[PDB]
Scaffold this active site. Structure first.
Site, PDB file in Angstrom:
ATOM      1  CG  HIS A  79      -1.952  -1.387   1.028  1.00  0.00           C
ATOM      2  ND1 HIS A  79      -2.425  -1.798   2.389  1.00  0.00           N
ATOM      3  CD2 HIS A  79      -2.430  -2.121   0.176  1.00  0.00           C
ATOM      4  CE1 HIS A  79      -3.189  -2.906   1.865  1.00  0.00           C
ATOM      5  NE2 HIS A  79      -3.110  -3.144   0.568  1.00  0.00           N
ATOM      6  CG  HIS A 238      -7.807  -2.393  -1.554  1.00  0.00           C
ATOM      7  ND1 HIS A 238      -6.871  -1.478  -0.656  1.00  0.00           N
ATOM      8  CD2 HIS A 238      -7.043  -3.358  -1.331  1.00  0.00           C
ATOM      9  CE1 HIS A 238      -5.908  -2.042  -0.338  1.00  0.00           C
ATOM     10  NE2 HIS A 238      -6.018  -3.157  -0.640  1.00  0.00           N
ATOM     11  CG  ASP A 242      -3.883  -4.336  -3.390  1.00  0.00           C
ATOM     12  OD1 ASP A 242      -3.334  -3.619  -2.524  1.00  0.00           O
ATOM     13  OD2 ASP A 242      -4.757  -5.217  -3.246  1.00  0.00           O
ATOM     14  CG  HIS A 265      -0.500  -8.239  -4.391  1.00  0.00           C
ATOM     15  ND1 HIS A 265      -0.241  -6.950  -4.801  1.00  0.00           N
ATOM     16  CD2 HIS A 265      -1.511  -8.308  -3.261  1.00  0.00           C
ATOM     17  CE1 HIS A 265      -0.725  -6.237  -3.641  1.00  0.00           C
ATOM     18  NE2 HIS A 265      -1.439  -7.034  -2.984  1.00  0.00           N
TER      19      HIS A 265
HETATM   20  O1  LIG Z   1      -4.886  -5.986   0.514  1.00  0.00           O
HETATM   21  C1  LIG Z   1      -3.821  -6.554   0.869  1.00  0.00           C
HETATM   22  N1  LIG Z   1      -2.682  -6.720   0.268  1.00  0.00           N
HETATM   23  O2  LIG Z   1      -2.498  -5.642  -0.777  1.00  0.00           O
HETATM   24  C2  LIG Z   1      -4.155  -7.511   2.072  1.00  0.00           C
HETATM   25  C3  LIG Z   1      -4.994  -8.695   1.570  1.00  0.00           C
HETATM   26  C4  LIG Z   1      -5.384  -9.691   2.583  1.00  0.00           C
HETATM   27  C5  LIG Z   1      -4.995 -10.778   2.691  1.00  0.00           C
HETATM   28  C6  LIG Z   1      -5.257 -11.766   3.836  1.00  0.00           C
HETATM   29  C7  LIG Z   1      -6.368 -11.282   4.710  1.00  0.00           C
HETATM   30  C8  LIG Z   1      -6.769 -12.197   5.709  1.00  0.00           C
HETATM   31  C9  LIG Z   1      -7.937 -11.815   6.477  1.00  0.00           C
HETATM   32  C10 LIG Z   1      -8.303 -10.607   6.356  1.00  0.00           C
HETATM   33  C11 LIG Z   1      -7.947  -9.486   5.248  1.00  0.00           C
HETATM   34  C12 LIG Z   1      -6.667 -10.028   4.547  1.00  0.00           C
HETATM   35  C13 LIG Z   1      -6.423  -9.312   3.600  1.00  0.00           C
HETATM   36  N2  LIG Z   1      -2.928  -7.749   2.855  1.00  0.00           N
HETATM   37  S1  LIG Z   1      -2.664  -7.043   4.144  1.00  0.00           S
HETATM   38  O3  LIG Z   1      -2.694  -5.564   3.844  1.00  0.00           O
HETATM   39  O4  LIG Z   1      -1.205  -7.211   4.446  1.00  0.00           O
HETATM   40  C14 LIG Z   1      -3.618  -7.463   5.317  1.00  0.00           C
HETATM   41  C15 LIG Z   1      -3.450  -8.898   5.670  1.00  0.00           C
HETATM   42  C16 LIG Z   1      -4.386  -9.358   6.786  1.00  0.00           C
HETATM   43  C17 LIG Z   1      -5.441  -8.505   7.450  1.00  0.00           C
HETATM   44  C18 LIG Z   1      -6.072  -8.860   8.508  1.00  0.00           C
HETATM   45  C19 LIG Z   1      -6.779  -8.067   9.117  1.00  0.00           C
HETATM   46  C20 LIG Z   1      -6.821  -6.892   8.830  1.00  0.00           C
HETATM   47  C21 LIG Z   1      -6.000  -6.143   7.794  1.00  0.00           C
HETATM   48  C22 LIG Z   1      -5.221  -7.193   7.087  1.00  0.00           C
HETATM   49  C23 LIG Z   1      -4.565  -6.559   6.095  1.00  0.00           C
HETATM   50 ZN   LIG Z   2      -4.034  -4.239  -0.790  1.00  0.00          ZN
END
Ligand SMILES: O=C(NO)[C@@H](Cc1ccc2ccccc2c1)NS(=O)(=O)c1ccc2ccccc2c1
Ligand SMILES: [Zn+2]
Ligand SMILES: O=C(NO)[C@@H](Cc1ccc2ccccc2c1)NS(=O)(=O)c1ccc2ccccc2c1
EC number: 3.5.1.108
Length: 300
Positions: A79, A238, A242, A265
């Protein structure tokens, strides 16, 4: 002459690390011409540098990272990397006293304000753009991502996510890129996931910083955040956020037309590597007179 950009001054912010749940201090530093984007861990002694490079990216079950020769990593760069691309920051050193970039609110917007604090400084060296000269496509089953020649920068993205909170009319988003459009339309769009997934990960000691404050959290049926969505199509915005970060891992803004169907990604990086590997598909261009610069990459 269109010039490379760095920061005017050093700035610092503290946030929560998604993985550890601990406070992480982020420092952004000016850097010299041609040095590019460098992420640096300063918890380690000596500190470890990770230059942003398409070949150094790895995707995990949770996020993206950059790795070094020894597979040491710095995580959650996705991000912040999008915000760099959005403001056209060519050279910068990004430090964290931890293994990960702070998650902030799950979008790129807090990083934009931090960059505005640091100011922009124009260096006396032409900014190099990557111009797409041939069509390049990569696939993963029914998913695909493509670059086509185009005098500008456009993105057209169809999301891979399927959920009651996402109508068919909200599954695709297309934009003509610019700093202002990135800031207004894309920067504030948050990442998202399932409550049961977050709870489960936290039960295993992971994602300890995860909360409503850094993601759209849905259950099987609805968005749970009390204030709801910032955009009716926040999810696909979003995913474009990304993609903008993924593509900028080459360290250059790209002149061409990007189209993706259910990409993410891994596939976006695959496209970037595929382009850079095919010599004839692209060329570096600079602009000695500001006139011929595509409108896409004008000053913020
Ligand atoms: O948008 C992202 N990366 O570009 C997030 C994607 C992601 C992956 C796995 C998840 C599992 C559970 C909830 C949300 C998730 C989102 N990756 S991240 O920004 O590093 C991220 C990963 C996990 C999170 C869990 C809970 C809140 C925010 C999160 C952000
Ligand atoms: Zn993201
Ligand atoms: O219409 C807008 N936003 O919805 C302009 C308003 C604006 C908003 C926030 C700012 C924050 C700090 C400085 C200036 C700002 C103006 N937002 S924008 O067109 O996306 C924009 C944001 C920041 C800029 C900094 C410097 C020049 C131009 C800018 C435009």
């Amino acid at each position: 002459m269109i010039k490379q950009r760095t920061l005017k001054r050093i700035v610092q912010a503290t946030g929560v690390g998604l993985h550890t749940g601990k406070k992480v201090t982020l420092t952004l530093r000016p850097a010299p011409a041609n040095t590019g984007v460098i992420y640096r861990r300063t918890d380690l002694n000596p500190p470890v540098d990770f230059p942003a490079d398409a070949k150094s990216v790895r995707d995990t079950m949770l996020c993206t990272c950059l790795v070094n020769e020894h597979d040491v990593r710095i995580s959650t760069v996705e991000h912040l990397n999008a915000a760099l691309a959005g403001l056209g920051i060519d050279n910068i050193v990004i430090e964290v006293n931890a293994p990960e970039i702070p998650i902030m609110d799950g979008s790129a917007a807090p990083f934009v304000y931090l960059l505005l604090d640091a100011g922009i400084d124009e260096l006396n060296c032409a900014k190099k753009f990557v111009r797409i000269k041939e069509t390049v496509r990569v696939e993963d089953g029914d998913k695909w991502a493509e670059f086509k020649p185009y005098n500008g920068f456009s993105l057209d993205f169809t999301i891979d996510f399927n959920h009651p909170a996402i109508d068919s009319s909200n599954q695709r988003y297309a934009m003509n890129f610019s700093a202002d459009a990135f800031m207004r339309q894309i920067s504030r769009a948050r990442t998202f996931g399932f409550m049961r997934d977050i709870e489960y990960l936290q039960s295993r000691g992971l994602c300890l910083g995860g909360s409503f404050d850094c993601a759209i959290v849905v259950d099987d049926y609805r968005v749970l955040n009390e204030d709801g969505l910032r955009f009716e199509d926040e999810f696909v915005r979003h995913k474009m956020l990304d993609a903008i970060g993924d593509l900028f891992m080459c360290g250059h803004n790209i002149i061409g037309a990007f189209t993706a169907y259910k990409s993410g990604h891994a596939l976006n990086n695959k496209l970037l590597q595929a382009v850079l590997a095919k010599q004839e598909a692209w060329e570096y261009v600079t602009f000695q007179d500001d006139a011929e610069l595509p409108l896409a990459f004008k000053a913020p």
